[PDB]
């Protein structure tokens, strides 16, 4: 009875205050229906607690507490809106996940890892989660807004010189090392998940496919994840059964990224997705550099050292061998201070809602239930306030 | 988000810590079944929380934490056991209420009033609740043990002189005034619910039929409650529809009690229950004193002043007129200090488990559910620790 004063207040615990309230609020939501109320055990309880619960729901953060300035990202289960909290006047990126889409698709437990990393990472390399809440229809994540836009946008607006490519690649290696040292492998390293902040420095903004490492730093997984252009050969092959791999899969993606940034195209580009999988499986033959592409000796060397089978890939003896590669040799920054040195592309913003670095972008209730189905159960424990 | 640090810690609130845990524990219990787990919303949630919940259940007070010395009372839904807490070695009376009997009988919300009064009354006239807990099968209430036994037992072991009858009646009036001043009318005032403690002083030990008063001190009720011998005429008639009455119904029972204690029989005794109801409805004619019964002028006067229709009953202008009745005139105590004066019958106990003042006294699982039925829902919020 001693430890509970601890557990309840510990933000990491699954049974803290906010989670206990989520439960009691999800229970009332999932039981208050016409048919269900014919049962009396249910109708009684809904009597005692329904009033007090509706009052508590009044003190809960709400979507209405925010103005939707505009949509800046689109997800598989919702969008990411640029918003301004009405009372504070502060701006944030707010991601929405539809409870109905996740339930219908039977994919209602993929967000825990992301929620945890963005909330507790406490790292300059990870987009920060200020608070997470929910209503009967959606899940909400209020995060720090990254006005710099992603790297897919930076790569299409500038012809990137090696000086920049070193900078970004170095920050990507540091961001992933931070994630690995938290016990996770990313598995979806790509330009779309890399955002630039107000100063032009990098942060990872998506962790939907992260996974907790072993006691050896490895994971057992039989599902190929990540965008086709960036899936490493070991992750691709794990789709055929008994995949066992470590963080080296993120290092492969860095190679694809560096290639794409300096060559202008992804190394295993193909007109079909299956075409790309095939190139990847046959990387020994399929990788090749364009004749007119002008790339330094070291740059081409680093790309080839990442783009090989795991057993001989750069980083197989630790991140230290990646950091000492000659391609990173320079006079502006070192591995300890890169984030406090001038970024290559400093954003030029005209206001707290300037979303010029983001391309523009262009409603299904649950069927009232017969008997209890528990559709709010998977989201008990999502709520979070710093 | 400010008030919650309050609510959660306020023992009176329905959504405090212990209640939030009851919910999350009742939910897991009511969802963890073979058939129910075929649904995935349920199976997922039962995965995330089932482990942590079973650990928390380990830190919960348990029936095994107590030795059952013997059964001292029997209830409609369970028994009252004399027990010793194993670790502390302290003795208590522990009442058990079967969840299955309450559910089957559809009477799973009658205990709230009692739980509240015994837990928060903080009065020398009310048996005290130290803690309430529960397991999947029972509800438990750990109360202070009253070794003196009840007044049904005292009346059958002694021929009670008026000196004593004043003492007990005065303590009964004070105990009920305490209950009324809490905003409740008792409605089951009888010798069985009156217990004597270690010193021989009185306390009320049952509040199963209490009801919150109006803003006028009255209640609207259409159900006759209480044991037949003690039901007042207004409570009996309310069974026929539109009952509206106040605390005067408790004063009537005091009259029945005083009569029984001095005459040796209840005033409206009959061989059948229906016989007794009839006498009560016809109290103007049915009340009469035995020829050989020797009762003082004042004693007989008080009995008759209580045993009349409400409109002319003693106490209709407040408890003050009851306390100043001449029958209570005496040299041992006054209304302010009666509880700290020598009791008439001081218990002679040989140990902390002496239950000689209590007569001796001489298993049905719920059918595994098909779909959710929620049988643990009515008891969410029962848990309580001082
Ligand atoms: O650019 S996002 O809208 C975005 C995500 C998270 C935090 C953000 C903060 N600021 C702007 C955009 C943000 N985004 C989601 C959809 C595609 N995947 C990765 C990035
Ligand atoms: O005597 S009890 O067992 C009892 C109740 C509550 C607290 C007690 C404390 N000590 C002894 C007996 C007690 N009891 C229950 C059954 C019949 N109704 C009223 C009294």
From Swiss-Prot, chains A, B:
Cellular component GO terms held in the UniProt record: centrosome; cytoplasm; cytoskeleton; cytosol; nucleus; plasma membrane
Active-site positions on this chain: 188 (proton acceptor)
Location of this chain's protein in the cell: Cytoplasm; Cell membrane; Nucleus; Cytoplasm, Cytoskeleton, Microtubule organizing center, Centrosome
GO molecular function: ATP binding; protein kinase activity; protein serine kinase activity; protein serine/threonine kinase activity; Rho-dependent protein serine/threonine kinase activity; small GTPase binding; zinc ion binding
Post-translational modification (record): Autophosphorylated. Dephosphorylation by PTPN11 stimulates its RHOA binding activity.
Residues with Phosphothreonine modification: 383
AGC-kinase C-terminal domain ranges (all copies): 331-386
Residue ranges constituting the Protein kinase domain according to the UniProt record: 66-328
Keyword hit for Lipid metabolism: no
Record GO biological process: actin cytoskeleton organization; actomyosin structure organization; cortical actin cytoskeleton organization; embryonic morphogenesis; mitotic cytokinesis; positive regulation of centrosome duplication; regulation of actin cytoskeleton organization; regulation of cell junction assembly
Transmembrane region(s): none
Chief place of localization: cytoplasm
Record's keyword annotation contains Cell membrane: yes
Tissue: Highly expressed in whole brain and in cerebellum, and at lower levels in heart and lung. Detected at low levels in skeletal muscle, spleen, liver, kidney and pancreas.
Interaction with NPM1: annotated span: 347-386
Keywords: ATP-binding, Biological rhythms, Cell membrane, Coiled coil, Cytoplasm, Cytoskeleton, Kinase, Magnesium, Membrane, Metal-binding, Nucleotide-binding, Nucleus, Phosphoprotein, Serine/threonine-protein kinase, Transferase, Zinc, Zinc-finger
Binding positions (ATP): 72-80, 95
Top-rank taxon, per record: Eukaryota
Known function: Protein kinase which is a key regulator of actin cytoskeleton and cell polarity. Involved in regulation of smooth muscle contraction, actin cytoskeleton organization, stress fiber and focal adhesion formation, neurite retraction, cell adhesion and motility via phosphorylation of ADD1, BRCA2, CNN1, EZR, DPYSL2, EP300, MSN, MYL9/MLC2, NPM1, RDX, PPP1R12A and VIM. Phosphorylates SORL1 and IRF4. Acts as a negative regulator of VEGF-induced angiogenic endothelial cell activation. Positively regulates the activation of p42/MAPK1-p44/MAPK3 and of p90RSK/RPS6KA1 during myogenic differentiation.
Domain notes: An interaction between Thr-383 and Asp-22 is essential for kinase activity and dimerization.
UniProt subunit comment: Homodimer. Interacts with IRS1. Interacts with RAF1. Interacts with RHOA (activated by GTP). Interacts with RHOB and RHOC. Interacts with PPP1R12A. Interacts with EP300. Interacts with CHORDC1. Interacts with BRCA2. Interacts with NPM1; this interaction enhances ROCK2 activity. Interacts with SORL1. Interacts with PJVK.
Family statement: Belongs to the protein kinase superfamily. AGC Ser/Thr protein kinase family.
Protein name: Rho-associated protein kinase 2
Lineage start: Eukaryota, Metazoa, Chordata, Craniata, Vertebrata
Section covered of the full-length record: 27 to 417 of 1388
